[PDB]
Design a protein around this ligand. Structure first.
Ligand SMILES: Nc1ncnc2c1ncn2[C@@H]1O[C@H](COP(=O)(O)OP(=O)(O)OP(=O)(O)O)[C@@H](O)[C@H]1O
Lengths: 675, 290, 107, 175
C-alpha cells in the first residue's frame, strides 16, 4: 500500500512504528492480536476439531551469519617477542563463551588457518574442551562467560599447561601437560582465535596486580608474566580483514605461474596453471590475478605499423589467451586500480563498486559527470557470445588503453568489442584477470603488441618508453588476491571524546591531541603502509635500510647540494619522529640517526674535530680572566664548563627552500632545530 | 658520482620507497543503518547535519583532515566496508564512502573541486546539511544553507548506509540528527526524513567509533571476532503462501461457526469495555459501528 | 600562467605592493600528490621580497594575486617553474607544481 | 580440604596448616615402606577401589581389561599430597624459596638432613641482594601477609621444615 517504518507515526508520510519484525514488535499490539487469536484457536478446539502440531525440531543455525570470508580472527603478539627459553605465563579472559582458542603460536603461523589445525600452533579450545596441535584431541573442560584461562609455557622442559580459573586442566589421562613434547624452533608467542560474535581479552601481565589467577597457579612455579620485564606495551598483530594482492608463492598448493620467454615469432607470456586440478580439495573458487606494475594515465587530457606513430603515441596493449578447456564464461579480462579489494565467491560484472560524480553550474545545469570505479573488465563468455568451436585457437582478448585520452577498449578476435570504459586522469590501471579454474590450463598474459599500439612494457617502464619490442622484465610478475596477511594494531589511538551536550545541541565529538604515524609508500603498487609494520617484513626493511645507507653515502663528506636535495625526501619532522619513536626497528632507527647526522651535523662536526688539536688563543680580557681552578679549593671543575676563548670554526647553516632560485644556499649544511 | 646518482635516482620517486608523516584519522558514525530493498519497510530519503564548533587548520605541519558524509557497508555487515581501520584514511578514501570537505567531493580516494557560494574549507561555525536519497541513488550537500553544486549518484545500494565524519586531531564538531538529538539549523528538503527516525524501537541512538578498536588499556581492550550480518536492518515480510492450499468443506461449515463466535467475541468485548454508536468518525471518541 | 583557488578567504583588500616583503607558509606538492617542500615542516615562515626574482615567478605572481591573511592553492606550469631542466634531485623535468600558500604577513 | 583450601589461602590458618606437615610425614612413611604397592594391589582387588568415585565426584562439590583400564593416579595418598602441597608452599616465602632451593640441591648432592641443618643455619645470616628488580617485585607481591616474615617465623624449626619439604619434593619428582 506504500507504508514504511518510522520511530513516530505519521499519516501524511505513511510512517508507522509497527512495521518491525515480530521479534522486535511491542507487546501491546502483540497481545491485542494474540487474545483474539487464542479465543479463535480455543473455539476451534471446543467445536470438536483437535489440532496437533506438525513436529518439534531441535536444529542449530550455527550462528555463522557473519561475512562468508571471515569465520574467525587471530590476535597474536609480535614475532620479535618469541621466547626460546624460560617459563612464561599469560591470561585470556573470555567475555563471552563460544568458539575461542588460546595458546602459543610459531612465528610462521598463518592468519587464515584454524589454531592447531597444523603444526604451527598449540591451542586450547574451551568451546568443545579440546587441545589443538596438528590434529584434535580431548583436553580439559568447557569454560563459561567471564572465565580466565591461564596459559603457561616451559621452554626449558618443553611443556605447556592450561588453567581454568586457577585450576589446572587435565587431558584424557591425569597428565597436567597439555603438550608433552615439541621442538623449540623459532620460539612461541601468545595467540588466540575468536569466532563469530566472540569477545576476548589477552593479558600479558605487564601489570602483575592485574592478573587474576597468577598467584593461585603460576606465581610460585617459576613462571614469568609475558611482559613483566618490559617498559613498553607489547605490539599487537591480528588477521587482516581486507585481502591484498601479493606475488604468487612458488610453493602454492593450487596456482602455478610460468614465465614464457618471447621468441622472434612469439611474445612474452605469463601462464597461470591450476596445478591441483583433478584431485582432492582442488580450489574451485574464483581467483583474482593482476600484474605487479600499473599503467598510469596522462595528468591532463587533451580536448605495417608506423614508426613515427608508435613513437608519438600513448596507446598500450596486452592480450590474455584463455586456453581450450577453460570455460570463457568463468574468466574476466580487463583492468583494476589499487582500490580493488573485493574477494567474493560469486563475482559478476554488474556488482563492481562504482560511483558517479556530477558537477553542475549554479542553477542545476549539469556540465560534467564522471564515472569512477576500480574494476574495468569484460567477460570472456559474453565476448564469445555465439557458441564457437572452442578448438580453432585459445580465446585471445586484447585490452587496449589510451593513456593520452583515458580510453579502455577491448578486442575479442580481431573485432572491437562494444564495451568500452573512460577513466579519470592520473588513474593507475593494473592488468587483471578474474578466473575460475575449469581446466589445468586456465590462461596466460601475452605481452605482445598489435598494429599502431605501443607494447605494455613501454608504459610500465620509463627506460623502455620508446622500445617497440615487447619485453617482460623480472619486476613484472603475477600477483593474486589472498588473505594470508597480518595487520599491526597501532600502539596509540586518537583520543576522541563523544558526549551528548543536550537535546538541542546534538552530539559533541571532540579531538585535540595530535597523533602522527610515518608512512612508507610503495610506488609500483600504489599502496602505503606504516613504517612500523616493517618489523615483520624483512625484504622491505633491508631495502629501506640500504636506501638510508645510500642517502648517507650520496651526501657523505660535505656534499651540501646533495644534502639540500635529500632534505626534500627526508624532512626534519620525519627525522624527529624516527629518532623519538620507541617501536621503530633497530636498522631503520640507526639508519635515520646516521641520516640526520650526515645531513645536518656532519660537516660542522668534522670541521671542529679538525680544528680540535690546534689552539689559537687571542688575547682579550676574557682570556686574562681564565684561571686553572674555579676557586681557591683546587678541585677540578666539570670538563667543558667554563670560559673558553680559543678560536673555533664558525657555525653557519642555510635554509633548505625549493621555491628560491638564489643558488647561494648550496654552501653550508641545511638548518635543523638545534635546541 | 654522488651528483649523478642523486640526480638520476632521487627525483623520480618511483623506485625507492617514500616516507612521509601522516596525521592519524578517526571516524565517528551514529548507530544507524539505512538500506533500500524490494519489499522492505525502510524509508528511502534521509537528512542530517554536522555543525563545526571549532577547528584548527594546522595542528601539525600537515593540514587538518575533516570530511563529512555517508558511508556504506559490505553486504549487510555492520563493518564499514573497503577501508582501513587504523588511520590515515577517512570518508571518501574508498568506493564505499562519499564525503565532502567544504571544497571537494571525495570518493574512491579521489577529490573533485565543487562550486559553492563563497567557497572555503570547513571552518568554525559551519553548518553542513547532508541528504541521501536511495530511490534514485543521490547524495547532496548544503553548506550554511547554500546548495553545493556537486552530487554523488549511481552508487552501489546493496549495503547499508550511515552518516559518518572523518577527522584528524584539532576539531570540535556536533552531529544534529533532528528531534531530540540536535535541532536542525535549516529546514530539511521536502521528502527527507531526519536521521533520528531510523532508530529501532528497542535500541537507543548513539554516536560511536566506526571501527572496533579505540584508545584503551592493553588488558582492558576487547578483542572481537567476526560479527553476524544485520538481518534485522532490512525488514522484508514474507509470509507462508495460502493460495496453493485448499479449504475443505468441513473446515468451511465449521469456519461459519468460528466466524460467528469471534464476531460475538468482539461485539461483547466492546460492550464490556465501552464502545457504542457514533454519528461522526473520530479517533478520540473510541467508538465503532460494528 | 598560474592557476589560483582560494581555500580560506582573506581580507580581500590588502595586496602585496611593490618593494614589500611577503611572509607566507607554503607546502609544495607535485601534481601526483607527493610533497617536496614545506615551510610548516621547518617551523619557519618563508619571507620573500616582491619583484626581485627571489622565487619562481609562478609563486611570485600567485602570491602577488593573493590577499592578506588568505590561504590558496596555486598551480604552476613548468613555464613559470623549473621547466624542462628542473631542479636536480628534487623536481623532475617538466613538472607542474601545486602549492598550499597562506599569506601570513606583509612587512 | 578442597572445600576450604581457598579460605585457608586467602586467610592463613596456622592451626589448619599442620595438616600439610602431617600428610607429608605420611608421605615419607609411604616412601619408607615398599610393601604398600603390593598390599595396595591386593587391597584394590580384595575390596574394590577405583578412586574414580572420588575423582569425578569432587567436581560437583567444588562447583568447578583391568590392566589397561586401571591406573595408580587415583591413589588417596598421592591425591592428598597434590591437594595439600599448595598450603605448605604458601607457608613458604619467596625468600624461603631460595632456602628450599639449596635444600633440594644438597638433597640431590645426597648430603644428610642432619648436616645440612647447621649449614643452612649458618647461611641464614648471608642474606640475598635486595635492590634487584625481580626479587624486589616478589616481596612487593608477598608483603600483603602481615606476620609471614622470617623475623616472626622461628628460624631452626622452619629450617627443619624446609629440609623436610625439600626431601618431599626430591622423592616426589626425581625419585
Ligand atoms: N471495535 C473494536 N473493538 C476493539 N478493538 C478493535 C475494534 N476495531 C478494531 N479494533 C482493533 O484495532 C485494530 C484495527 O484493526 P481492525 O479490526 O480495524 O482490522 P483491519 O482493518 O484489518 O486492521 P488490522 O490489520 O490492523 O487488524 C486491530 O488491532 C483490532 O483488534
Amino acid at each position: 500500500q506504500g507504508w514504511t517504518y518510522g520511530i513516530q507515526q505519521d499519516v501524511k508520510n505513511r510512517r508507522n512504528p509497527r512495521l518491525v519484525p515480530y521479534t522486535l514488535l511491542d507487546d501491546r499490539t502483540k497481545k491485542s492480536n494474540k487474545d483474539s487469536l487464542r479465543e479463535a484457536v480455543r473455539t476451534l478446539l471446543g467445536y470438536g476439531y483437535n489440532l496437533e502440531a506438525p513436529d518439534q525440531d531441535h536444529a542449530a543455525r550455527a550462528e555463522v551469519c557473519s561475512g562468508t570470508g571471515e569465520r574467525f580472527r587471530i590476535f597474536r603478539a609480535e614475532k620479535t617477542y618469541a621466547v626460546k627459553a624460560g617459563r612464561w605465563y599469560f591470561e585470556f579472559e573470555t567475555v563471552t563463551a563460544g568458539d575461542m582458542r588460546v595458546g602459543w603460536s610459531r612465528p610462521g603461523c598463518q592468519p587464515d588457518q584454524e589454531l592447531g589445525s597444523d603444526e604451527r600452533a598449540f591451542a586450547f579450545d574451551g568451546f568443545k574442551a579440546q587441545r589443538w596441535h596438528q590434529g584434535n584431541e580431548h583436553y580439559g573442560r568447557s569454560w563459561q562467560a567471564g572465565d580466565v584461562v591461564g596459559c603457561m609455557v616451559d621452554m626449558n622442559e618443553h611443556t605447556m599447561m592450561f588453567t581454568l580459573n586457577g585450576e589446572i586442566l587435565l587431558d584424557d589421562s591425569g597428565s597436567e601437560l597439555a603438550f608433552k613434547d615439541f621442538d623449540v624452533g623459532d620460539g612461541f608467542i601468545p595467540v588466540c582465535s575468536l569466532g563469530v560474535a566472540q569477545v576476548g581479552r589477552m593479558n600479558f601481565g605487564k601489570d602483575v596486580s592485574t592478573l587474576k589467577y597468577f598467584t593461585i597457579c603460576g606465581l610460585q612455579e617459576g613462571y614469568e608474566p609475558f611482559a613483566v620485564n618490559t617498559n613498553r606495551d607489547i605490539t599487537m598483530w591480528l588477521s587482516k580483514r581486507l585481502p591484498q594482492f601479493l606475488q604468487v608463492p612458488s610453493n602454492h598448493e593450487h596456482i602455478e605461474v610460468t614465465r614464457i620467454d618471447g621468441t622472434i615469432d612469439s611474445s612474452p607470456c605469463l601462464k597461470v596453471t591450476q596445478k591441483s586440478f583433478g584431485s582432492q580439495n582442488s580450489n574451485t573458487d574464483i581467483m583474482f590475478y593482476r600484474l605487479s606494475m600499473p599503467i598510469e594515465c596522462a595528468e591532463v587530457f587533451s580536448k605495417r605499423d608506423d614508426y613515427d606513430f608508435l613513437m608519438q603515441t600513448s596507446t598500450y596493449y596486452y592480450s590474455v589467451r584463455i586456453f581450450p578447456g577453460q570455460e570463457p564464461a568463468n574468466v574476466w579480462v580487463g583492468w583494476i586500480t589499487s582500490d580493488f579489494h573485493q574477494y567474493d565467491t560469486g563475482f559478476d560484472l554488474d556488482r563492481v563498486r562504482t560511483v558517479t560524480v556530477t558537477l553542475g553550474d549554479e542553477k542545476g545545469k549539469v556540465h560534467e559527470s564522471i564515472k569512477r570505479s576500480n574494476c574495468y573488465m569484460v567477460c570472456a563468455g559474453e565476448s564469445m557470445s555465439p557458441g564457437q568451436g572452442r578448438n580453432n585457437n585459445g580465446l585471445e582478448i586484447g585490452c587496449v588503453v589510451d593513456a593520452a585520452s583515458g580510453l579502455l577498449t577491448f578486442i575479442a578476435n580481431g573485432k572491437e568489442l562494444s564495451t568500452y570504459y573512460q577513466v579519470e586522469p592520473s588513474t593507475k590501471l593494473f592488468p587483471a584477470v578474474f578466473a575460475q579454474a575449469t581446466s589445468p590450463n586456465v590462461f596466460q598474459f601475452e605481452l605482445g603488441r598489435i598494429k599502431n599500439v605501443m607494447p605494455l612494457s613501454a608504459g610500465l617502464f620509463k627506460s623502455e618508453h620508446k622500445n617497440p619490442v615487447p619485453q617482460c622484465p623480472p619486476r613484472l610478475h603475477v600477483q593474486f588476491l589472498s588473505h594470508v596477511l597480518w595487520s599491526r594494531m597501532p600502539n596509540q589511538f586518537l583520543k576522541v571524546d563523544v558526549s551528548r551536550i543536550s537535546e538541542r545541541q546534538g552530539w559533541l565529538v571532540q579531538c585535540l591531541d595530535p597523533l602522527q604515524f610515518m608512512s612508507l609508500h610503495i610506488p609500483e603498487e600504489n599502496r602505503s603502509v606504516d613504517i612500523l609494520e616493517l618489523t615483520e617484513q624483512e625484504e622491505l626493511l633491508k631495502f629501506h635500510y640500504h636506501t638510508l645507507r645510500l642517502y648517507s653515502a650520496v651526501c657523505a663528506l660535505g656534499n651540501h647540494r646533495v644534502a639540500h636535495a635529500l632534505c626534500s625526501h627526508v624532512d626534519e619532522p620525519q627525522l624527529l619522529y624516527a629518532i623519538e619513536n620507541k617501536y621503530m626497528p633497530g636498522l631503520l632507527r640507526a639508519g635515520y640517526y646516521d641520516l640526520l647526522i650526515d645531513i645536518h651535523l656532519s660537516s660542522y662536526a668534522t670541521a671542529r674535530l679538525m680544528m680540535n688539536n690546534e689552539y689559537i688563543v687571542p688575547m682579550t680580557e676574557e682570556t686574562k680572566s681564565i684561571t686553572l681552578f674555579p676557586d681557591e679549593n683546587k678541585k677540578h671543575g666539570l670538563p667543558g664548563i667554563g670560559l673558553s676563548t680559543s678560536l673555533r670554526p664558525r657555525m653557519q647553516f642555510s635554509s633548505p627552500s625549493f621555491v628560491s632560485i638564489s643558488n647561494e644556499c648550496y654552501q653550508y649544511s641545511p638548518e635543523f632545530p638545534l635546541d | 658520482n654522488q651528483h649523478l646518482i642523486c640526480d638520476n635516482l632521487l627525483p623520480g620517486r618511483d623506485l625507492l620507497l617514500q616516507t612521509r608523516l601522516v596525521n592519524h584519522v578517526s571516524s565517528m558514525r551514529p548507530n544507524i543503518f539505512l538500506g533500500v530493498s524490494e519489499g522492505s519497510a525502510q524509508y528511502k530519503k534521509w537528512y542530517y547535519e554536522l555543525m563545526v564548533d571549532h577547528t584548527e587548520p594546522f595542528v601539525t605541519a600537515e593540514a587538518t583532515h575533516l570530511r563529512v558524509g555517508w558511508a556504506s557497508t559490505e553486504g549487510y555487515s555492520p563493518y564499514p566496508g573497503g577501508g582501513e581501520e587504523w588511520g590515515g584514511n577517512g570518508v571518501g578514501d574508498d568506493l564505499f564512502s562519499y564525503g565532502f570537505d567544504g571544497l571537494h567531493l571525495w570518493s574512491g580516494c579521489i577529490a573533485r573541486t565543487v562550486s559553492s557560494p563563497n567557497q572555503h574549507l570547513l571552518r568554525t561555525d559551519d553548518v553542513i546539511s547532508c541528504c541521501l536519497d536511495l530511490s534514485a541513488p543521490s547524495i547532496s550537500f548544503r553548506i550554511n544553507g547554500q546548495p553545493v553544486q556537486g552530487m554523488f549518484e549511481n552508487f552501489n545500494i546493496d549495503g547499508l548506509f550511515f552518516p559518518v565524519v572523518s577527522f584528524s586531531a584539532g576539531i570540535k564538531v556536533r552531529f544534529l540528527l533532528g528531534g531530540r538529538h540536535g535541532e536542525f539549523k535549516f529546514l530539511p528538503p521536502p521528502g527527507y526524513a531526519p536521521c533520528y527516525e531510523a532508530v529501532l524501537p528497542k535500541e537507543k541512538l548513539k554516536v560511536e567509533h566506526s571501527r572496533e578498536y579505540k584508545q584503551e588499556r592493553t588488558y582492558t581492550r576487547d578483542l572481537l571476532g567476526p560479527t553476524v550480518s544485520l538481518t534485522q536492518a532490512a525488514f522484508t515480510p514474507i509470509p507462508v503462501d495460502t493460495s496453493q492450499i485448499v479449504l475443505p468443506p468441513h473446515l468451511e461449515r465449521i469456519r461459519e461457526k468460528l466466524a460467528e463466535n469471534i464476531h460475538e467475541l468482539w461485539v461483547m468485548n466492546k460492550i464490556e469495555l465501552g464502545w457504542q454508536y457514533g454519528p461522526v468518525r473520530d479517533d478520540n471518541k473510541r467508538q465503532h459501528p460494528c | 600562467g598560474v592557476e589560483i583557488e582560494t581555500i580560506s578567504p582573506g581580507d580581500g583588500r590588502t595586496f602585496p605592493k611593490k618593494g614589500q616583503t611577503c611572509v607566507v607558509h607554503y607546502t609544495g606538492m607535485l601534481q601526483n600528490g607527493k610533497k617536496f617542500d614545506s615551510s610548516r615542516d621547518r617551523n619557519k615562515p618563508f619571507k620573500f621580497r616582491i619583484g626581485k626574482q627571489e622565487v619562481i615567478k609562478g609563486f611570485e605572481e600567485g602570491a602577488a594575486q593573493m590577499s592578506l591573511g588568505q590561504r590558496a592553492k596555486l598551480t604552476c606550469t613548468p613555464d613559470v617553474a623549473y621547466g624542462a631542466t628542473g631542479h636536480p634531485g628534487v623536481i623532475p623535468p617538466n613538472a607542474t607544481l601545486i602549492f598550499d600558500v597562506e599569506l601570513l604577513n606583509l612587512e | 580440604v578442597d572445600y576450604n583450601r581457598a579460605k585457608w589461602l586467602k586467610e592463613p590458618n596456622p592451626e589448619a596448616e599442620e595438616l600439610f606437615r602431617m600428610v607429608a610425614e605420611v608421605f615419607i612413611y609411604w616412601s619408607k615402606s615398599h610393601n604398600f604397592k603390593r598390599e595396595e594391589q591386593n587391597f584394590v582387588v580384595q575390596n574394590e577401589i577405583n578412586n574414580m568415585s572420588f575423582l569425578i565426584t569432587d567436581t560437583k562439590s567444588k562447583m568447578s581389561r583391568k590392566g589397561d583400564r586401571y591406573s595408580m593416579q587415583t591413589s588417596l595418598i598421592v591425591a592428598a599430597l597434590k591437594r595439600l602441597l599448595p598450603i605448605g608452599l604458601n607457608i613458604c616465602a619467596p625468600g624461603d624459596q631460595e632456602l628450599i632451593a639449596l635444600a633440594k640441591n644438597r638433597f640431590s648432592l645426597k648430603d644428610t638432613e642432619d648436616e645440612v641443618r647447621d649449614i643452612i643455619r649458618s647461611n641464614i645470616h648471608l642474606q640475598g641482594k635486595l635492590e634487584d628488580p625481580a626479587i624486589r617485585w616478589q616481596m612487593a607481591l608477598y608483603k600483603d601477609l602481615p606476620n609471614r616474615t622470617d623475623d616472626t617465623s622461628d628460624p631452626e624449626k622452619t629450617v627443619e621444615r624446609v629440609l623436610d619439604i625439600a626431601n618431599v619434593l626430591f622423592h616426589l619428582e626425581q625419585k
